[PDB]
Design a protein around this ligand. Structure first.
Ligand SMILES: NC(=O)C1=CN([C@@H]2O[C@H](COP(=O)(O)OP(=O)(O)OC[C@H]3O[C@@H](n4cnc5c(N)ncnc54)[C@H](OP(=O)(O)O)[C@@H]3O)[C@@H](O)[C@H]2O)C=CC1
Ligand SMILES: NC(=O)C1=CN([C@@H]2O[C@H](COP(=O)(O)OP(=O)(O)OC[C@H]3O[C@@H](n4cnc5c(N)ncnc54)[C@H](OP(=O)(O)O)[C@@H]3O)[C@@H](O)[C@H]2O)C=CC1
Ligand SMILES: CN(Cc1cnc2nc(N)nc(N)c2n1)c1ccc(C(=O)N[C@@H](CCC(=O)O)C(=O)O)cc1
Ligand SMILES: CN(Cc1cnc2nc(N)nc(N)c2n1)c1ccc(C(=O)N[C@@H](CCC(=O)O)C(=O)O)cc1
Ligand SMILES: N#Cc1ccc(CC(=O)O)c(NC(=O)c2ccc(Cc3c[nH]c4nc(N)[nH]c(=O)c34)cc2)c1
Ligand SMILES: N#Cc1ccc(CC(=O)O)c(NC(=O)c2ccc(Cc3c[nH]c4nc(N)[nH]c(=O)c34)cc2)c1
Ligand SMILES: O=c1[nH]c(=O)n([C@H]2C[C@H](O)[C@@H](COP(=O)(O)O)O2)cc1F
Ligand SMILES: O=c1[nH]c(=O)n([C@H]2C[C@H](O)[C@@H](COP(=O)(O)O)O2)cc1F
Lengths: 508, 506
């Protein structure tokens, strides 16, 4: 009655595992994971059994694996008794007799090609699945991993790792069966006595119907959950509130999201995100530009709503040209406190250049605690087409020469602005890291008013029904001299396999 | 084999539970907690047994409690068989016969005065302890709860609640006697050294974790500060800075505090609340004169405002304590041309605080209640750049005022407790002037660090189990936010641990 687990590394979409008798990739850390998970035992006087098919036995050179016993399933191989570390069986059913007569075997691992995988799943021999999702799909496969049956549920999904620009995950699946202690009861009783006087009741845990992949309870390591859980928390505790637009929101206050940038790029996979528009807006900020037409001329329409004749006249800026957004992010980054006139004037030399001072300080005094870039200028708020949402950012150089970023966001549209903000400040930190000579670190986003617009409810709930996939990789094709020299052609997005786009309208 | 639990409400320091045959307090929610915890059962055809002494049986009027069976320990009361809800036993040992006989009893609760408590603990009959710590100590007691034996460890400590300006907690004590997900995470952590972000955010070891036995019940929001200390001690990188005292630093941290039922003033260390208030009202008035704080026996800005320090950072033209345009000058005169600490600035710059107050009561659901202090044009003139850089304020649907604060650099030994209390008081001041109630306080930290000369001190502070937060009330309602005085502040139920001396790094 010992445990039987599948160990497999398959592609993220088509679940390919092999091609021409070998693997479609070469990931060293994945093999180490196979080695450590198949050697993991509890009894020093027992060994683990690794079951594999004959063709898989050929692909590993027909040589034994240390500290383990390999069980080859073959109809033609001679049942040789010379090697005690390799044993041959004529069928998979007869091979699963290490449970009974062989008390010297502690755990059993199935890992031997499509034929053995499919037979082990069809006959319900498998209890656990150790899946390594690999972000490679536009290549050739001839051997696939079977679709995981509905009797299995995911219980763990690791963060995204990177090897030679290849993104990969680690997941565990458990086969469902039938059907502290008093701390939960005491907390529930306290919540019944104190209604909303108990702060726990104002931060209720999301219900299962709005929880992304609810079967993953204690292993929600993938940092896309940092965004999906915020959606669920809003759906559970968001107060219905009006705002300056005609579209009400469900809002909560004081939230946090954390993302890794060392081994992945925080571009959401549960929805296809317009990465090009994000980059074009970011380089538009860096150049100090406030002319909205330059984004529209590059097929980027995210600032069209807040820069129309009707919207500008409504907020009392009818004197402006159609897309003259005024002194905003790009103008406070390069010309802070500069007297703004129009989008056509020359501002070279005006205001404080925070971005230049930031870059100079990052490489000359890295351990300084004042790497701050702000956009909140109370003297210029009335002239802006929209006050800053990503208000302030701080940057940090670790001891191992990595650049981390903290961002405070006063207002967060979780449907549209939030994924853009995550990717935008990830790219910005990477740009600062390359110009200053560091590596990307971490990205923390601290949110004030985190809200969901009521016309996004059907869409975001749809997005919550999609299990996340490994984050992609973002690499720069060339090293630039000035941070303003980055071009969209210099960006390489590797291994991005998202779910279909989800259309959502912006509230003007 | 059946469960035996003590339910008791005792004072926070002396563990007093009674006076003159009655309770030393009147907390309605505590009685409701007693009712819910003693009625909590699993079988609908069973009842719970409440064991109490005779004097306690007298104090409750000698009347039965619904749905439960009261067991009175007395040597004189007649063993009457008329009332089935009240049964009398001659001693506590013989009374613990609900274990073997009477299968109709599911759980057993001991709750009957000092004599029964002490006997139940001395004979090792008790498995669990439900303690309600009450923040009342300068009153008279004649009945005390025994000192909890070392065989018990706390497993839960609730947030601080308030009833009639009385702070109280809820704790659980236990007597000491997935699966493969943790293994897979450990294996992945062995393969990827610090490439796995979990290894860069390691869970603190037990030796630096405050009350490590409370694992799943760290509800008390003082843990939001103590655990941050532990995280720094576990993952902090040793780094140099502008001062001669190196720190252990981490980046990107968060603390959350409740202000509806308590005031976030740390109990594991006596915090100078008066100096915090005087600094805050000094900010609100728009004052940059460091002498006005020194004249009020507040010396927190003496180090960053000396002749030697100002000359060192290139401000030798300044007067002794002319700190320059800092907190409160950017609040009241943002972008205002700063001259000296004595000039008249009435009307210059943008008054963020006034606009903030006006917007909070005229447009509460606005998403732009922002108060900033980071002025890149004035950084060179400041004696010290702002640490609490930016704050945002939020009006809930039930007319509560919450506050978010971003802090670029956080001295966890000295500045952090001051910052927590300071912005707590500021939110309360804004709430009263705008006509709201205090809400929540979230603090987002960039460079959270511990100075190396605070290591012995902070580890000492981590050895102290937290106590209920106190209460902060205003004695009068003011017309303008600048009119608050220290005499208008009432700090109720503050019973901290001894002060811990720590030197500031200049
Ligand atoms: N990414 C990953 O995790 C893994 C990938 N792979 C890859 O997959 C490929 C190999 O898989 P695959 O092509 O399906 O071959 P298999 O590994 O499944 O081995 C098949 C052989 O096993 C024997 N066999 C299979 N079923 C039975 C049965 N019901 N009764 C008796 N004997 C049986 C047969 O050998 P015989 O002819 O002797 O009778 C058969 O030819 C390789 O490219 C390999 O590298 C393999 C393992 C893991
Ligand atoms: N804050 C809280 O949670 C609680 C507080 N209290 C307070 O504490 C006070 C009461 O406690 P306390 O003064 O200690 O009195 P007790 O409630 O402990 O009752 C004592 C009586 O129980 C009987 N008794 C005790 N021990 C024995 C024994 N070993 N054998 C036989 N009979 C025994 C005796 O009754 P007899 O004379 O008949 O022999 C004795 O007089 C009250 O003020 C009450 O309000 C009470 C409960 C809870
Ligand atoms: C059957 N097979 C193909 C193969 C390749 N990648 C996989 N990856 C996963 N996640 N799961 C599998 N079953 C798997 N199988 C294998 C099996 C073992 C070794 C191997 O060389 N293992 C060494 C690992 C060497 C190392 O430390 O790098 C060991 O000690 O177990 C290679 C391919
Ligand atoms: C023995 N005793 C004194 C008393 C008072 N406060 C306490 N508080 C605690 N935490 N623990 C105790 N053992 C305790 N005991 C009692 C016991 C029951 C009631 C009582 O009236 N209980 C009603 C409560 C009525 C209501 O809902 O408020 C019930 O239904 O249980 C009062 C005092
Ligand atoms: N899925 C998806 C998806 C598909 C296409 C697009 C447009 C594009 O790819 O070009 C988008 N993004 C936006 O349509 C978008 C995203 C961010 C902003 C910033 C912004 C400015 N002012 C705002 N005011 C409100 N209220 N909220 C906001 O997000 C903003 C404005 C628009 C998302
Ligand atoms: N326990 C304790 C305890 C006991 C007494 C006092 C002083 C008093 O009660 O009056 C204190 N607080 C301070 O001594 C103190 C607290 C906060 C500051 C703000 C500050 C300005 N510049 C700083 N620079 C550094 N590096 N760090 C800092 O905290 C500050 C400066 C000093 C703490
Ligand atoms: O980068 C952005 N991120 C974002 O979340 N918004 C959304 C938040 C909110 O829905 C709206 C701002 O309206 P308000 O000023 O009332 O917060 O824009 C806008 C951006 F430009
Ligand atoms: O409110 C404050 N909080 C705080 O933590 N500091 C500490 C943080 C740091 O130890 C020092 C500033 O050093 P630096 O300018 O390098 O961030 O002041 C100062 C304040 F005024």
């Amino acid at each position: 009655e010992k445990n039987v687990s599948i160990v497999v590394a398959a592609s993220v979409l088509s679940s390919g595992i092999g091609i021409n008798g070998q693997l479609p990739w070469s990931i060293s850390e994945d093999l180490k994971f196979f080695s450590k998970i198949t050697n993991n035992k509890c009894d020093s006087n027992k060994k683990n059994a690794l079951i594999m098919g004959r063709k898989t036995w050929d692909s590993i050179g027909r040589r034994p694996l240390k500290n383990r016993i390999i069980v080859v399933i073959s109809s033609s191989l001679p049942q040789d008794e010379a090697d005690p570390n390799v044993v041959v069986f004529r069928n998979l059913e007869d091979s699963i007799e290490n449970l009974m007569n062989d008390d010297s075997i502690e755990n059993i691992f199935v890992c031997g090609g499509e034929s053995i995988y499919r037979d082990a799943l069809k006959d319900n021999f498998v209890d656990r699945i150790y899946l390594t999702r690999v972000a490679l799909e536009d290549i050739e496969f001839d051997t696939y991993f079977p679709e995981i049956p509905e009797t299995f549920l995911p219980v763990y999904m690791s963060q995204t790792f990177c090897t030679k620009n290849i993104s990969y995950d680690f997941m565990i699946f458990e086969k469902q069966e039938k059907k502290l202690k008093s701390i939960d009861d005491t907390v529930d009783l306290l919540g019944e006595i104190f209604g909303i006087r108990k702060m726990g009741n104002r931060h209720k845990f999301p219900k299962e119907e709005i929880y992304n992949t609810p079967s993953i309870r204690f292993g929600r390591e993938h940092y896309e959950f940092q965004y999906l859980d915020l959606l669920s928390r809003v759906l559970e505790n968001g107060a219905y509130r009006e705002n300056r637009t005609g579209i009400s929101t469900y809002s909560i206050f004081g939230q946090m999201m954390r993302f890794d940038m060392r081994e992945s790029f925080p571009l959401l996979t549960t929805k296809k995100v317009a990465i090009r528009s994000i980059f074009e807006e970011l380089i538009w900020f860096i150049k100090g530009d406030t002319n909205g037409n330059h984004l529209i001329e590059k097929k980027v329409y995210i600032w069209s709503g807040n820069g129309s004749k009707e919207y500008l006249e409504r907020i009392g800026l009818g004197h402006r040209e159609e897309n003259d957004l005024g002194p905003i992010y790009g103008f406070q980054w390069r010309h802070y406190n500069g007297e703004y006139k129009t989008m056509h004037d020359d501002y070279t030399g005006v205001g404080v250049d925070q971005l230049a001072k930031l870059i100079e300080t990052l490489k000359n005094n890295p351990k300084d605690r004042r790497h701050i870039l702000t956009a909140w200028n109370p003297s210029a708020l009335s002239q802006m087409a929209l006050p800053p949402c990503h208000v302030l950012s701080q940057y940090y150089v670790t001891n191992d020469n990595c650049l981390s970023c903290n961002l405070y966001q006063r207002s967060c549209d979780l449907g549209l602005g939030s994924p853009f903000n995550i990717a935008s400040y990830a790219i910005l930190t990477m740009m600062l890291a390359q110009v200053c000579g560091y590596e990307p670190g971490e990205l923390a986003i601290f949110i004030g008013d985190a809200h969901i617009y009521e016309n996004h409810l059907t869409q975001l709930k749809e997005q919550l029904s999609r299990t996340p996939r490994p984050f992609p990789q973002l690499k720069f094709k060339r090293k630039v001299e000035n941070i303003e020299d980055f071009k969209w052609e210099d960006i390489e997005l590797i291994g991005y396999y998202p779910y279909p786009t989800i259309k959502m309208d912006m509230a003007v």
